């Protein structure tokens with residue numbers, strides 16, 4: 739229905755706003771673009787499902803997210819990929835892991851404060867009906 743399309747449009751506006759706030763945070767720069775194979779050739783082979791904030795924006799605009807739960811799965815993937823790719827004790831790896839956890843924690847905190855639970859429930863019920 740048109741009311742349901744309005745609901746998903748509001749969801750997309752909300753998700754673009756959250757994503758923009760993450761993307762402008764200097765700590766999260768490493769997560770804003772796909773990994774360049776010229777700089778890191780072994781990435782594309784170790785990480786089977788890459789994800790980054792630019793790809794998240796593209797997915798919002800392609801209407802790939804019908805709930806915040808599905809968006810958070812991709813935030814979780816950005817973080818889990820970073821932990822997997824940077825598992826060593828060396829400070830470069832530890833810095834990226836700390837930033838990855840901060841990205842995840844920040845996204846969840848914004849959503850806890852700003853997502854209305856009944857709005858998310860409505861999205862989930864529309865999604866389940868299709």
Ligand SMILES: CC(=O)c1csc(NC(=O)[C@@H](C)[NH3+])n1
Nearest residue numbers: 768819820823824830831834
């Ligand atoms: C997106 C991501 O997790 C990423 C990009 S480079 C990197 N790791 C390093 O640069 C190590 C070698 N210090 N991780």
Ligand SMILES: [Cl-]
Nearest residue numbers: 765767768833
């Ligand atoms: Cl840096």
